[PDB]
Design a protein around this ligand. Structure first.
Ligand SMILES: [Mg+2]
Ligand SMILES: [Mg+2]
Ligand SMILES: [Mg+2]
Ligand SMILES: [Mg+2]
Ligand SMILES: [Mg+2]
Ligand SMILES: [Mg+2]
Ligand SMILES: [Mg+2]
Ligand SMILES: [Mg+2]
Ligand SMILES: [Mg+2]
Ligand SMILES: [Mg+2]
Ligand SMILES: [Mg+2]
Lengths: 105, 166, 55, 140, 68, 78, 121, 97, 42
RNA sequence: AACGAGCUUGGUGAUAGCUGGUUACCCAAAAAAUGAAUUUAAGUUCAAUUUUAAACUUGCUAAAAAAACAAAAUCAAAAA
RNA sequence: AUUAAACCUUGUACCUUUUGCAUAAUGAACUAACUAGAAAACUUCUAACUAAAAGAAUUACAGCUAGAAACCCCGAAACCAAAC
């Protein structure tokens, strides 16, 4: 799978830490259903943990969009232009919080 | 079955601006259900690839194969529609950008054998496609010189890096 | 057929049966069904015990 | 046919996506592709262990080349550096040889220096005092 | 080490001499590594994916002091 | 098959290690009589721990909260 | 027939030169053994396999402390060839409750009660 | 494998049609009605399996017992052959003796 | 009965919230995977 | 158009101790191919093993003398 | 792995069997679809009620009642009946 896949060298976006450290995650989007079993854990994340995460990370803009939805989805966008999307369907509050922190790091 | 080759002549580009090279015309033509093997037709289609319209016709006129006349007739029709419908000024100013053969829908029949045994024979059909591009044929292939070969070798040497280390 | 705090009954049963065993009895509390299950046969002692309490 | 599998398209693409860089019908025919992919994965897993050992062999060769330039065999370089309480590993010793030649020459001189002391010590019989570079820094 | 001199610990240099400072730049996970053993009836699904947490450190400074 | 030089030494090295093992097993601190009973208490307690776990198997408790907590799957924002 | 072996007693009767070589006094014998497994029980008879598990020497090169008493020694003699027996030595005395967490077993066989990881100075 | 290139028409289900809305009513006809009727008497189905359950050999024998005398020749011949096959399967074949 | 007070807090009981008693249902095994397929236990 | 006994349909999903095949993942444990009977040795039933659950208590290694033998196993106090 | 597709290094196709062994022997040109474990006597788990349980006929010296939990596919030479 090494020869069936691409590879690169170790690198940083803009010499991230030489002068000052900049957080690469810049935007998080959370889509919810107001009344849907699969989005329950995400709903609890918004009630309890989303506000604390935003305060701890003031350089990330967090968008929470409650709307009729079949699967909750988290979209993460970085300064280099990369975008990562995660299905949050029927995950517990802790898993979502654990995943959200990984995106920030 | 799909018939996308015919549709390609219907593409319409927007008007070109004054400061732009003139876009060469392209004409797509085909003859579909030809009673002839595509394997046999490939050789005739292969030979005329890259030639001018007149040069292709001259070679086809003196080939003994059945497919040569079929390709020649298609080429003449492509030439006429190019000037008649596609705003090509000079009939001679055309070259074969693409020429290939494809499988057609075939019929299954019985091949009789010695002891009441049989085989399944195929009555084969094939398609033939061409694209004619306005302009002189692109310049022929130029082989690499010895100096060019040497230059590539030295570049490979200069690209070497110390492997598996800091 | 236990109604109320089934855990309080477990506490009393353990104390009542501990001296007889010399060790704490092993018990299961099924809070959904309202029953208390004890390892070993103590039906007669528990029947007399529950009569004194007046149930 | 009350219940027919409807997702076989994606189950097939699971294997074929790993086989697209093969040559021949292995790269597109599932019955052949699946057998090839299973051998590729087994080879990848076993190659993970082999990669570490091959890198060490590469380092030892590169260290031998570097030490031989100063006149030292590989065993003499390694053991006598250890006897000086220098714990540089073979991977780092190669980085110094390629990129820090002046430092590596110092290590060669230190290794040869300690080696000579050992030769004198064995002939010394223990009456002679211990060499300057042969002293061991104790820890507790 | 420098251009003209080097200091070797036995096995480690004293804190007074050398201070090396680094910063954590990224906490990440490795790309999926396939772990598939060879067994009778190997199959394509008798496969494990190993993903390991990773940390990236940028070395910031190396400083020395005259305390030999 | 002539035996290699390295093969011969490695056997000798192992023999010397075992030869020393003979020496250290030749000086028992306690005699057979003195040994009797010195560890009786610890052995007695250890088996009691073994028996206690073996004879303590019983089903687990069942709670109403487990059954009723399933209704939270339909929890919502009003 | 491969069978369990009974060693003649003379093997375990040492000689005066042996005490000088290994530096052990025939009087004041050591109390505790340091035993490590240095060979595999694969390809060895099952009785040798059994004792190795009884003695706790399942992992190789990991030391186990055992009593220097005849009953234990009898088991060790069964697997003598698969193990290294080293006398446990206490230069600074037995570890106490205060020093129980600061011990370290050295390769020399000495259990130090103070482990600092600092130059001796 | 080949997959649909279009989405099928969406399925529209009326959850409050009369049949869905009133499903289950009178399932307690006995206990709430003084036991004049057993709930099984509300089951609609083949005459030989209203308020009854069994394995396939039992069902085949029960259908023959109930409506065997009103069956068509093709059907009755097929039913009888099914009985003999199931009889040999259940009484002679299987892992467990 | 505090348990009835718990029902007051919880969401409505409905056909979508139903659950069998724990361990009331065993799993039926079909001979499809490698574990129970192949020779199928025979 | 392959008769030591035609062909077609049906009985019929004949029967086959025989050959072949028997479709997702993960975790755990695991025999042995020994003894006995069988128109039985290409199979089956029982023992023996293995295994799951449960009950409660000693098991494994070792094991002096001492008998039984004739002049390394059986037995198994104490201990460890 | 590599700066680099091939060069360098590592590596005795799959299934089925054979004694746990494959340089054995079967089977597979390839694609798509189809194509093979099924039952409740005892046992276990989950509940109702309990010296009684079951909506008639049954079991019962803690039982009884209900639920859940199980045992493949293709293939002969043949035999018989009635037609042709
Ligand atoms: Mg003919
Ligand atoms: Mg053909
Ligand atoms: Mg190695
Ligand atoms: Mg296996
Ligand atoms: Mg004939
Ligand atoms: Mg059959
Ligand atoms: Mg047979
Ligand atoms: Mg007979
Ligand atoms: Mg005993
Ligand atoms: Mg043969
Ligand atoms: Mg089944």
């Amino acid at each position: 799978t090494g020869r069936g896949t691409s590879s690169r060298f170790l690198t940083s976006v803009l010499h991230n830490g030489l002068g000052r450290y900049v957080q690469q995650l810049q935007r998080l989007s959370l889509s919810l259903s107001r009344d849907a079993p699969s989005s329950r854990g995400a709903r609890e994340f918004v009630e309890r943990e989303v506000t604390d995460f935003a305060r701890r990370n003031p350089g990330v803009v967090v968008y929470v969009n409650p709307r009729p939805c079949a699967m909750p989805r988290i979209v993460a966008e970085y300064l280099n232009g990369a975008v990562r999307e995660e299905n949050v369907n029927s995950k517990s509050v802790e898993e979502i919080k654990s995943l959200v922190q990984k995106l920030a790091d | 079955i799909s018939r996308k080759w015919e549709k390609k002549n219907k593409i319409v580009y927007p008007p070109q601006l004054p400061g732009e090279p003139r876009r060469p015309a392209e004409i797509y033509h085909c003859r579909r259900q030809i009673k002839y093997s595509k394997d046999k037709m490939w050789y005739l289609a292969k030979m005329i690839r890259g030639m001018s319209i007149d040069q292709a016709l001259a070679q086809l006129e003196f080939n003994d194969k059945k497919g040569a006349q079929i390709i020649k007739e298609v080429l003449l029709e492509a030439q006429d529609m190019a000037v008649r419908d596609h705003n090509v000024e000079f009939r001679s100013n055309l070259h074969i950008a693409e020429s290939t053969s494809g499988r057609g829908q075939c019929l299954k029949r019985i091949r009789y054998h010695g002891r009441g045994r049989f085989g399944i024979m195929e009555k084969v059909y094939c398609h033939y496609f061409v694209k004619l591009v306005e302009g002189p044929p692109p310049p022929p292939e130029v082989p690499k010189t010895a100096v060019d070969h040497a230059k590539d070798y030295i570049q490979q040497l200069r690209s070497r890096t110390i492997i598996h280390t800091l | 057929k236990v109604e109320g705090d089934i855990w309080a009954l477990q506490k009393d049963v353990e104390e009542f049966l501990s001296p007889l065993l010399g060790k704490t009895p092993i018990t299961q509390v099924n809070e959904v069904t309202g029953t208390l299950r004890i390892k070993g046969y103590f039906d007669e002692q528990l029947k007399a015990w529950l009569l004194e309490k007046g149930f | 046919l009350r219940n027919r599998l409807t997702d076989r398209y994606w189950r097939v693409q699971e294997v074929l996506k790993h086989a697209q860089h093969f040559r021949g019908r292995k790269n597109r025919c599932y019955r052949l592709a699946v057998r090839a992919v299973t051998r590729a994965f087994v080879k990848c897993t076993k190659a993970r262990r082999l990669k570490k050992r091959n890198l060490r062999t590469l380092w030892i060769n590169r260290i031998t080349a570097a030490s031989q330039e100063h006149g030292l065999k590989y065993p003499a370089f390694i053991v006598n550096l250890i006897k000086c309480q220098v714990e540089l590993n073979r991977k780092v010793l190669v980085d110094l040889a390629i990129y820090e030649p002046k430092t590596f020459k110092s290590l060669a001189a230190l290794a040869k220096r300690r080696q000579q002391e050992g030769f004198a010590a064995a002939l010394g019989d223990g009456k002679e005092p211990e060499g300057i570079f042969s002293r061991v820094v104790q820890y507790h | 080490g420098a251009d003209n001199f080097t200091l070797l610990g036995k096995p480690l240099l004293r804190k007074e001499l050398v201070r090396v400072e680094a910063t954590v730049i990224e906490k990440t996970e490795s790309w999926p590594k396939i772990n598939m053993k060879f067994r009778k009836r190997k199959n394509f699904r008798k496969k494990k994916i190993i993903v390991n947490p990773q940390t990236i450190l940028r070395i910031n400074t190396i400083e020395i002091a005259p305390r030999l | 098959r002539t035996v290699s030089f390295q093969a011969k030494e490695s056997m000798i090295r192992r023999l010397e290690v075992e030869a020393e093992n003979h020496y250290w097993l030749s000086m028992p601190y306690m005699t057979a009589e003195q040994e009797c009973g010195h560890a009786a208490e610890r052995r007695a307690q250890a088996f009691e721990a073994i028996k206690a776990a073996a004879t303590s198997k019983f089903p687990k408790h069942r709670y109403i909260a487990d059954q009723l907590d399933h209704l939270n799957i339909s929890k919502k924002w009003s | 027939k491969f069978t369990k072996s009974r060693i003649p007693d003379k093997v375990f009767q040492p000689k005066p030169e042996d005490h000088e070589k290994y530096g052990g006094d025939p009087q004041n014998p050591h109390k505790l053994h340091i035993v490590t497994r240095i060979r595999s029980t694969k390809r060895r008879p099952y009785w040798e396999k059994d004792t190795i598990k009884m003695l706790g020497l399942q992992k190789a090169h990991s030391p186990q402390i055992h009593k220097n008493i005849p009953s234990v020694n009898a088991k060790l003699k069964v697997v003598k060839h698969l193990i290294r027996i080293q006398p446990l030595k206490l230069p600074q005395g037995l570890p106490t409750e205060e020093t129980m967490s600061s011990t370290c077993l050295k390769s020399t066989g000495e259990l130090v009660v103070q482990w600092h990881l600092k130059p001796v100075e | 494998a080949f997959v649909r290139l279009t989405l099928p028409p969406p399925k529209v289900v009326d959850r409050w049609n009369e049949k869905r809305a009133l499903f289950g009513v009178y399932d307690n006809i006995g206990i709430l009605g003084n036991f004049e009727k057993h709930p099984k008497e509300l089951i609609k189905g083949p005459v030989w399996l209203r308020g009854w359950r069994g394995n396939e050999l039992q069902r085949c024998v029960r259908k023959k017992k109930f409506v065997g005398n009103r069956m068509f020749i093709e059907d009755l011949h097929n039913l009888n052959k099914r009985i003999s096959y199931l009889y040999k399967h259940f009484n002679r074949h299987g892992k467990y003796r | 009965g505090t348990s009835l007070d718990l029902l007051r807090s919880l969401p409505r009981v409905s056909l979508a919230n139903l659950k069998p008693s724990p361990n009331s249902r065993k799993r039926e095994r079909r001979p499809r995977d490698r574990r129970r397929g192949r020779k199928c236990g025979r």
